Design a binder for this molecule. Structure first.
Ligand SMILES: COc1cc([C@@H]2c3cc4c(cc3[C@@H](O[C@@H]3O[C@@H]5CO[C@@H](C)O[C@H]5[C@H](O)[C@H]3O)[C@H]3COC(=O)[C@H]23)OCO4)cc(OC)c1O
Ligand SMILES: [Mn+2]
Ligand SMILES: [Mn+2]
Ligand SMILES: [Mn+2]
Ligand code: NA
Ligand code: NA
Lengths: 189, 481, 483, 190
DNA sequence: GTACCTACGGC
DNA sequence: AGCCGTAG
DNA sequence: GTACCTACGGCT
DNA sequence: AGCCGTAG
């Protein structure tokens, strides 16, 4: 599933995590194959906050990301072994895309935290006009979201580890009531 | 530039949570619909898929809905349309399907390219008066279309067909009800705003499942109607009968709502195979389109068949609970509601719909009467009208001269200029006069309704009674005390 | 019906299927160069008003309407056929204008039909031009609830322009694409000489012209294909040898043969290197980008002969591919192996028929309009007596009969008078009616001149073809090298 | 994939081979589950005349039919072991349905010939023309094609084995030219 | 969101 | 512990 | 085309 | 070989 880049110098290499093969094809055609890799996901990915370790380690999508990043996970994580110094989240420009992004960030925070701390995790900013990235032509996906000369990438920053720990547990954990209370308190209709 | 993980998580998760709550998994209290079902039904109306017209290929219906209103996968649209066509899923089906639309055994429908669909007669009542400024239209997802925020829903569809939905931070589980009972309940509420839940339960006995069956007791029903939450015990319709040679059998003809018949049978077979139940010699599904649901459980000679039946209730879905959790969108916000609240919000929607329709009809009739007044002047002075037009070199000059000479408005002069020569015949002349006289009587009838809130409320009652008389049916589920 | 013999059952059921695949699936019509699925998509786009000036429509909506109205088959067959028509690497003159992921040369599929959008290209307007001018025969659709064209007017030679490939039953087809300037020039030369030879036609039509450009080795395979309808054409990638530094060299491939999957061709080169079936390759990279275009780099070992390596790659990989020409098309609803002249002759006959039918339609339409104007002229000249006749009439039928008898009018003329709006009575209308009528009489004589002289009609076909050539004709892409 | 019947008395049991899962579901609903089994086929099935034995034996659709029939194949065929005395071919009343029928008959003739000779192979006659079997309601599929009181089944008969051998080889074999010659000779373009 | 069979002809 | 039904 | 992977909550 | 492209 991984459509890797030519270069083997991780400092200049970027990996784009897209939602499906519909966005994958566009991304593969539009990219700079020398420094940009594409990893198409399979829609909604496993929530590691609700899953046990055996299920996480057996999940094909989670495995594919670990293999592609080349760092290893948890206590065995090695930042020097990172295959890309830019891990770019490029989900579709819809509410489900926002959900996949939360699920991806949950996985990186709980299994690859030093990757966030090193500033390797990014969020792509595609235009609002199209929902599915498959709706976009390869040239417009390049110019607006992948071209380093014109793109606007958001570098994911970790400020407070205690606050982040509580945020991931509340939003993604098994306790429905704290999530329901968060919605009630912050919902703007 | 930079983005804090905590801020990113809170914002992205709330955006998704909110969208699932107000725009996916929860039904609106007014029409009892979720966005996908509302878009299908509105789509069916826009495509002219009424019960009198022939069936249209499902893929064409789905493609239009997907493109115009629902920017999601076709399976979500198609499977939602399939559910609305199943007499075992919907207490009052909303879609009339042609082809394989699935079974109680969990068999899927045929591919959308093979099946065909149209509205049911009762769906006309959900859509009735939608183009009479009765409900608010909103912009679609891309701004290229318009879609209804809610349907007029001339029968109480939330409670009639029920709802089930898994959202974020909450879920919903509203059981279906009998339409005769519901309308009678709405009528009683319309005559007494202070009616109690207990009083409403004189009309609404409890849920009424499309799959019939039994409900054990009223305590679970009562708790659910009073608070919006309660556990309802559903039982299959089962009898014990002789089969010859002193042997007996258990015959199941009705199963609990949302229970897959094939999976319930396999669970009985599993229990027998693993010796977790004693006394069963055979297990057959004798169900046919021509005989209805018929599950046969053969009992060993001299074994107590009632003991076996009771064990089946304890150990299989032959007895299933329905966990009532009545969450619906009230003013665009999710709310746990009791029976009275659901009926109150529904009755308010109906009063608003009938008032708005009466206001729309008045404006249109007044506009048409104004045009007919112009046409009547033209017919009364047709020789002078023709001369005025003939002496004008342009359309603009004819317009201004007609307005000036005969004290006509721009709209009246335009209607006169658009009038075809065939409108000057004896029959066509009289048609204009007869329409105008009928319109004047219609205008006063509408003004009478708008001047008296009691007359308006009686019209809501009368229109609900008509739907009750036409679509109301017998109770299916037996509530045993 | 009781019994059925297995031999009779097999022969009838197999022939029914075989025939349907031949005349209604896998083979293109010689006239418009289309198979039923492609014709139904284009007709569908026209009926839905999906012209190049209007915004793109969601592919699922186009496909659903085509499936429901004309093509009772799977949506993937419809959608994937529409996708190919939108690919500049598949179609020499694309027929569909696509918005979104429509696939690549690496065999990547298009995005799901719910994501993509489409409309006609400007050249497709030329395939559909005059369809509603009684130029082609319409037939009943599969269920009798619709009407569909049996063939498109096809105002440019689309069979040869875009080519065709199809696997039928008992036969197949493989027609390569061609250059539109060359084809129209060939049609023009044929129109001035019915006895033109294949060799003479080849002065205009050099050979195939692939959307993927590249090279053709020699004219012998082209000649045989044009003379008989069958021949083997050697296609070569566009490859050069260049320096890369430190006395080292590389092979750079910028164009590949038609219908060759670039990713699959690269994997075959890698496989040869891995299995040591080729000597001298140190690296293999696909440097293709939207900016650079196709760029396949094959690094060569220092002091190794790069030309020897390139020649070995031509022999052992799709870097050199043959195009097996087998020109089978539907001629009078029957499959036929045709030569170049045959294909052009049937195409020119279709154009003569289309332009003649259009001129006949326009004449009937102008004669009908002149007849109506004559009625309106009378009504305006006696408007007071027309109004009185209508006013004294109780019904429409009575007004109709009275107008017909009193003013010597036909049923059509009386109806047009009764349908006339009061605004048509303004002062300058009588002059407009007179001017239109005088112009129409002139138009009628112009049309009658075309229909009376077969040379005038044939010159009009030539003129309209020249216009399309000037507007849509482009440069040759494939280089034909002398072997 | 097999939706078997209640009865285990093959003389009264029938197996319907239906074109697609879309047709399968409606036939499973419309049938008499006591004596009628349903085996859906995922479109175009393998042509055994063009395929070698390993490919035939490894094919999922072929294996499913052998398992369902319970007779075995070729030299190991046993008619007494037939699980159904009626094998009913139920495809769409269109050209592709006709093709699936030829492919099915090719398989029965070359691997289960005594099944044809015994009169166990039948052809269902659903309402002719228009859309597929999935377009039909369960009650209309029962009344027109599956109900023994109103259905019209065609019993497949083998008259000349030499003629049938030649027919299957010409129509379904690897030699394109003899098939092309058959089409040319018998094709009526109207 | 995904994976995977089959007919058919020619080279 | 796996199912209900809209979503990727 | 179909039965699969995934989120999500509340019943069992 | 296995691929081309309309079909189940
Ligand atoms: C499983 O349920 C049935 C399947 C079928 C077959 C089929 C059979 C398959 C198989 C796949 C298919 C599948 O082909 C796939 O379509 C995909 C459609 O989207 C595009 C993007 O990609 C296509 C794949 O290239 C192709 O492989 C079906 C599509 O339409 C058919 O007719 C195909 O993989 C294994 O065996 C027939 C039936 O009854 C008639 C069924 O009930
Ligand atoms: Mn998506
Ligand atoms: Mn069919
Ligand atoms: Mn599909
Ligand atoms: Na989906
Ligand atoms: Na080669």
């Amino acid at each position: 599933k991984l459509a890797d880049c030519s270069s083997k110098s991780p400092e200049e290499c970027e990996i784009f995590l897209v939602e499906g093969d519909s966005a994958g094809g566009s991304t593969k055609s539009g990219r700079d194959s020398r420094t940009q890799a594409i990893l198409p996901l399979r829609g909604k990915i496993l929530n590691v906050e609700k899953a046990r370790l055996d299920r996480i380690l057996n999940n094909n999508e989670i495995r594919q990301m670990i293999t592609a990043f080349g760092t290893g996970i948890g206590g065995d994580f090695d930042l020097a072994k990172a295959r890309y110094h830019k891990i770019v989240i490029m989900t579709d420009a819809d509410v489900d895309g926002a959900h996949i992004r939360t699920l991806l960030l949950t996985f990186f925070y709980r299994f690859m935290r030093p990757l966030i701390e090193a500033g390797y995790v990014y969020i792509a900013q595609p235009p609002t006009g199209y929902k599915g990235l498959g709706e976009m032509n390869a040239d417009q996906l390049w110019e607006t979201t992948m071209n380093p000369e014109h793109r606007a990438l958001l570098q994911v920053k970790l400020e407070d580890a205690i606050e982040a720990d509580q945020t991931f547990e509340m939003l993604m954990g098994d306790v429905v009531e704290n999530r329901r209370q968060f919605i009630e308190d912050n919902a703007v209709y | 530039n930079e983005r804090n993980i905590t801020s990113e998580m809170r914002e992205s998760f709330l955006d998704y949570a909110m969208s699932v709550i107000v725009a996916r998994a929860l039904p609106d209290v007014r029409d009892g619909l979720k966005p996908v079902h509302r878009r299908i039904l509105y789509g069916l109306n826009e495509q002219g898929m009424t019960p009198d017209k022939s069936y249209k290929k499902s893929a064409r219906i789905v493609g239009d809905v997907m493109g115009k209103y629902h920017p999601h996968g076709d399976s979500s649209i198609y499977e939602a349309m399939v559910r609305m066509a199943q007499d075992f899923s919907y207490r009052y089906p909303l879609v009339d399907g042609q082809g394989n639309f699935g079974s109680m055994d969990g068999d899927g429908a045929a591919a959308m390219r093979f099946t065909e669909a149209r509205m049911t007669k009762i769906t006309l009542e959900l859509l009735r008066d939608i183009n009479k400024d009765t409900i608010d239209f909103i912009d679609n997802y891309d701004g290229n279309e318009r879609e209804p925020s809610v349907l007029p829903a001339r029968f109480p569809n939330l409670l009639a067909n029920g709802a089930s939905g898994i959202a974020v931070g909450m879920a919903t589980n509203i059981p279906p009800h009998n339409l005769t009972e519901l309308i009678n309940g709405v009528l009683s509420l319309s005559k007494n705003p202070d009616i109690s839940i207990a009083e409403l339960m004189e009309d609404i006995e409890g849920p009424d499942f499309p799959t019939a069956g039994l409900i054990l007791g009223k305590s679970g029903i009562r708790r659910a109607y009073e608070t919006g939450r309660g556990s309802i015990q559903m039982r299959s319709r089962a009898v014990i009968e002789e089969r010859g040679g002193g042997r007996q059998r258990i015959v199941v003809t009705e199963i609990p709502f949302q229970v897959n018949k094939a999976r319930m049978i396999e669970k009985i077979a599993e229990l027998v195979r693993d010796k977790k139940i004693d006394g069963i010699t055979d297990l057959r599904d004798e169900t046919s389109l021509r005989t209805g649901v018929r599950v046969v459980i053969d009992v060993r000679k001299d074994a107590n068949a009632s003991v076996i039946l009771n064990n089946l209730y304890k150990q299989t879905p032959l007895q299933t609970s329905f966990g009532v959790n009545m969450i619906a969108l009230v003013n665009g916000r999710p709310k746990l509601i009791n029976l009275k609240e659901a009926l109150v919000h529904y009755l308010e929607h109906q009063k608003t719909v009938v008032r708005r329709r009466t206001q729309y009809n008045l404006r249109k009739a007044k506009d048409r009467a104004h045009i007919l007044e112009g046409l009547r002047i033209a017919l009364d002075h047709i020789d002078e009208i023709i001369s005025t037009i003939r002496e004008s070199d342009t359309d603009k000059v004819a317009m201004e001269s007609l307005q000036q000479r005969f004290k006509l408005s721009e709209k009246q002069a335009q209607a006169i200029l658009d009038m075809r020569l065939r409108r000057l015949t004896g029959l066509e002349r009289d048609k204009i006069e007869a329409e105008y006289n009928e319109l004047l009587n219609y205008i006063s009838e509408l003004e009478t309704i708008l001047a008296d809130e009691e007359v308006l409320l009686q019209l809501v009652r009368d229109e609900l009674t008509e739907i009750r008389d036409r679509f109301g049916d017998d109770r299916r589920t037996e509530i045993q005390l």
